């Protein structure tokens, strides 16, 4: 219960930190979009591990 509750909180805090490391800025916007799509799929996958 508590270990899994803590992990999930630690995982979301980590996901938020990843989004915060990709702040919005032609070439820079294309680069920004690629990195957001990547953070999104990682977050989606990490979170799915906690959703069953």
């Amino acid at each position: 219960s508590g270990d899994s509750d803590e992990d999930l909180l630690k995982a979301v805090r980590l996901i938020k930190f990843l989004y915060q490391s990709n702040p919005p800025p032609r070439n820079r916007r294309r680069r920004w979009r690629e990195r957001q799509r990547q953070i999104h799929s990682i977050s989606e996958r990490i979170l799915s591990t906690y959703l069953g």
Partner: antibody
Amino acid sequence: QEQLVESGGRLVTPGTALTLTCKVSGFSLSGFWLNWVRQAPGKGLEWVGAIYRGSGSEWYASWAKGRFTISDTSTTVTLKLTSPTTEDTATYFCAADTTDNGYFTIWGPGTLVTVSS
Amino acid sequence: ELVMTQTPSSVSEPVGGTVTIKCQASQSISSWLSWYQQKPGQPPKLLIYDASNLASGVPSRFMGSGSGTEYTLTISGVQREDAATYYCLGGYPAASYRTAFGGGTELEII
């Protein structure tokens, strides 16, 4: 360019707290997973844990929790063995994930820890 | 929590033969699977990443594939230099089930 060097490997009595250091150099990236992997003599690789370098986000194997502490420094990542046993005898490697995708692209040569009574 | 069951434990193949190494994930890991090669006295080397992508500087004879929970490392034309021990790595550090290595496969070349 990218380099990892582990140090601190010694012969220790069981229960003697020990710290290993992973000297991190030539990484363009700011944040990345810096992992700790161990290998007992003649055995397989075992994941100990990792820290995501920009943050203080530590993740441990079920068996590693309480017995190992991963700490982040400016130019280093440390692995402290809080109270080692004979079962902790291994070469300890640090391995960096350069993409955030989960796989290890850069490894250190390893540091040997011997735990004997 | 995540367990990677690696089979076989050992394989003996003559030069030019095909080697098949399997890893079964105890949980759904998707493309969170990589293959490593380790020779004595050396740290492991990345072969395959994201289940099926060939890593930089790895011979084309190394192939990775995955279907659901089953992952395969194929070495099509085995060479003498391919004698080593092989490991898969599944999962992610922040996943509920963490990350884990398979028990390894010792490849010997006849």
